[PDB]
C-alpha cells in the first residue's frame, strides 16, 4: 500500500523573474553588472531577486503634487512639487510609509 505524488511544481530562477519594485539594473564600464535601489538610493552588486516556486495542482495616475518628467538627455524622473524634491523612483511604486512609533511624550501603559 501507498500512493504516488501528484505534485506539479514550477521553479523559476532569479533572473528569469523581474526585478523587485524600485530597482534598476546597470553595467560598469567593464560590463560588470550591478543594481540600483531607488527605494533607498543605494547600489550593490548583489541581485535582489529570489527564485520562485509555484505549485500548479489542487501604471495609473500620479499622486497629488507629483510629476513625471524627462531631462534634456532624455532620462525619465519624478518631481515632488509639494517638497521641491526629485526622485528616480515612480511615486506609484512606493509602498505605504513607515508609521513612526508613538511619541516618547505620549500617554501609555506599562507592561515591562
Ligand atoms: Ca531611465
Ligand atoms: Ca538611471
Residue numbers in the entry: 140 to 197, 214 to 267
Lines from the paper:
The type I WW domains bind to a consensus ‘PPxY’ motif (where P is proline, x is any amino acid and Y is tyrosine, also known as PY-motif) with very modest affinities (with Kd in the range of a few to a few tens of µM). To achieve this goal, we determined the high resolustion structures of 7 representative WW tandem/target complexes, and measured the binding constants of >100 WW domain tandems or isolated WW domains binding to known or previously unknown targets.
The two WW domains of YAP are also arranged next to each other forming a WW domain tandem. We were able to obtain high diffraction quality crystals when the Dendrin PY23 sequence was fused to either the N- or C-termini of the YAP WW tandem. We solved the structures of these two versions of the complex. First, the inter-domain linker of the YAP WW tandem is unstructured and there is no C-terminal helix following YAP WW2. Thus, the two WW domains of YAP do not form a supramodule due to very limited inter-domain contact. This is supported by the two versions of the complex structures solved, in which the inter-domain orientations are obviously different. Second, the Dendrin PY23 binds to the YAP WW tandem in a parallel orientation (i.e. PY2 binds to WW1 and PY3 binds to WW2), instead of the antiparallel binding orientation observed for the KIBRA/MAGI2 WW tandems. This is again likely attributed by the lack of inter-domain interactions between the two WW domains of YAP so that each domain can freely choose its more preferred PY-motif.
